Design an enzyme around this catalytic site. Structure first.
Site, PDB file in Angstrom:
ATOM      1  N   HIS A  63     -58.593   0.757  46.637  1.00 22.91           N
ATOM      2  CA  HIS A  63     -57.327   0.749  45.924  1.00 22.91           C
ATOM      3  C   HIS A  63     -56.727   2.122  45.720  1.00 22.91           C
ATOM      4  O   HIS A  63     -55.556   2.196  45.323  1.00 22.91           O
ATOM      5  CB  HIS A  63     -57.443  -0.008  44.593  1.00 22.91           C
ATOM      6  N   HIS A  93     -57.768  10.977  41.486  1.00 21.41           N
ATOM      7  CA  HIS A  93     -57.197  10.086  42.479  1.00 21.41           C
ATOM      8  C   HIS A  93     -55.686  10.029  42.279  1.00 21.41           C
ATOM      9  O   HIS A  93     -55.135  10.626  41.346  1.00 21.41           O
ATOM     10  CB  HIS A  93     -57.804   8.698  42.319  1.00 21.41           C
ATOM     11  N   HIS A  95     -51.817   7.640  42.826  1.00 16.44           N
ATOM     12  CA  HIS A  95     -51.031   6.425  42.994  1.00 16.44           C
ATOM     13  C   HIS A  95     -49.749   6.824  43.700  1.00 16.44           C
ATOM     14  O   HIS A  95     -49.202   7.897  43.447  1.00 16.44           O
ATOM     15  CB  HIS A  95     -50.705   5.768  41.632  1.00 16.44           C
ATOM     16  N   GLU A 105     -47.029   5.991  38.080  1.00 18.58           N
ATOM     17  CA  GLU A 105     -47.371   4.961  37.108  1.00 18.58           C
ATOM     18  C   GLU A 105     -46.600   5.182  35.821  1.00 18.58           C
ATOM     19  O   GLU A 105     -45.844   4.314  35.385  1.00 18.58           O
ATOM     20  CB  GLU A 105     -48.898   4.929  36.901  1.00 18.58           C
ATOM     21  N   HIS A 118     -54.129  11.530  38.809  1.00 15.39           N
ATOM     22  CA  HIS A 118     -54.931  11.343  37.599  1.00 15.39           C
ATOM     23  C   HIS A 118     -56.247  12.093  37.748  1.00 15.39           C
ATOM     24  O   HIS A 118     -57.048  11.767  38.641  1.00 15.39           O
ATOM     25  CB  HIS A 118     -55.232   9.845  37.427  1.00 15.39           C
ATOM     26  N   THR A 197     -55.578   2.221  34.072  1.00 12.72           N
ATOM     27  CA  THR A 197     -54.467   1.500  34.689  1.00 12.72           C
ATOM     28  C   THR A 197     -54.899   0.532  35.783  1.00 12.72           C
ATOM     29  O   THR A 197     -54.044  -0.095  36.424  1.00 12.72           O
ATOM     30  CB  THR A 197     -53.395   2.449  35.222  1.00 12.72           C
TER      31      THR A 197
HETATM   32 ZN   LIG Z   1     -55.065   6.303  38.127  1.00 13.11          ZN
END
Ligand SMILES: [Zn+2]
Length: 265
Positions: A63, A93, A95, A105, A118, A197
């Site tokens: 993911h 990591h 997003h 996010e 993050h 999240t």
């Molecule tokens: Zn994250």
């Protein structure tokens, strides 16, 4: 086996069935309304001490991708700001979106960025990450927005290795990466209590979201999109739009470490 992901059939609007805390009182991410997120002079300056950070490996977990660090000592630690005690860096990591107009996010007055980093840290009073996630003060996550513009040299070593971890489960050695290269000039920030999240969505996070984005080139972000959600020997599903939408703030207060142009007093 996990059912959850980012698709129509298993995405964020489905997560509450297996993780009812998805409808909790302190869920993340959130929109940061900069008028109502008030300056707090009680907040101390952030201390981001990464000079001794020891990276170990990079991994596609199905993911996102994670860069993991040796968290056995207080090498790479976050302290100060709203935090009581010392928080060790365990991994970072990202997003990102299917296009440059979305992917973060958190949002700032409803504005999205192309990606969000993050940096995840755990509170040393609890002894390891698995223990810390079980506690409201267990984690501190430093969130940093990525804004499309000039290439970022601090990201280049990451982008350069992504072709070696294209599919879920693949990992590669990744030593000597310096996360100091991912920090903007200013450490001004907003902070609020929230959650992971992704599932299990635990409400264990002190969020520290930096005001100033770091740059990324369009080419750099495009390489994130060459990663795949799927594993080897399975049909290809591009890893894109791995962001959770913003969630209700409910009764929380977001605090600013600095005086924003929407504040007055
Ligand atoms: Zn994250």
């Amino acid at each position: 086996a996990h059912h959850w992901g980012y698709g129509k059939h298993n995405g964020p609007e489905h997560w509450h069935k297996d993780f009812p805390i998805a409808k909790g009182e302190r869920q993340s991410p959130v929109d940061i309304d900069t008028h109502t997120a008030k300056y707090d002079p009680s907040l101390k300056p952030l201390s981001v001490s990464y000079d001794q950070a020891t990276s170990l490996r990079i991994l596609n977990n199905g993911h996102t991708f994670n860069v993991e660090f040796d968290d056995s000592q207080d090498k790479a630690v976050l302290k100060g700001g709203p935090l009581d005690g010392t928080y060790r860096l365990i991994q970072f990591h990202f997003h990102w979106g299917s296009h440059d107009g979305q992917g973060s996010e958190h949002t700032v007055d409803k504005k999205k960025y192309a990606a969000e980093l993050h940096l995840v840290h755990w509170n040393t009073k609890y002894g390891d990450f698995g223990k810390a996630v079980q506690q409201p003060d267990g984690l501190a996550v430093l969130g940093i927005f990525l804004k499309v513009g000039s290439a970022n040299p601090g990201l280049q070593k990451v982008v350069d290795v992504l072709d070696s971890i294209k599919t879920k489960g693949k990992s590669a050695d990744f030593t000597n990466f310096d996360p100091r290269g991912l920090l903007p000039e200013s450490l001004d920030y907003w902070t609020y209590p929230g959650s992971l999240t992704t599932p299990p969505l635990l409400e264990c996070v002190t969020w520290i979201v930096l005001k100033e984005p770091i740059s990324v080139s369009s080419e750099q972000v495009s390489k994130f999109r060459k990663l795949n959600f799927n594993g080897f020997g399975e049909p290809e599903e591009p890893m894109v739009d791995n962001w959770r939408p913003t969630q209700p703030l409910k009764n929380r207060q977001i605090k600013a470490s600095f005086k924003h142009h929407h504040h007055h007093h």
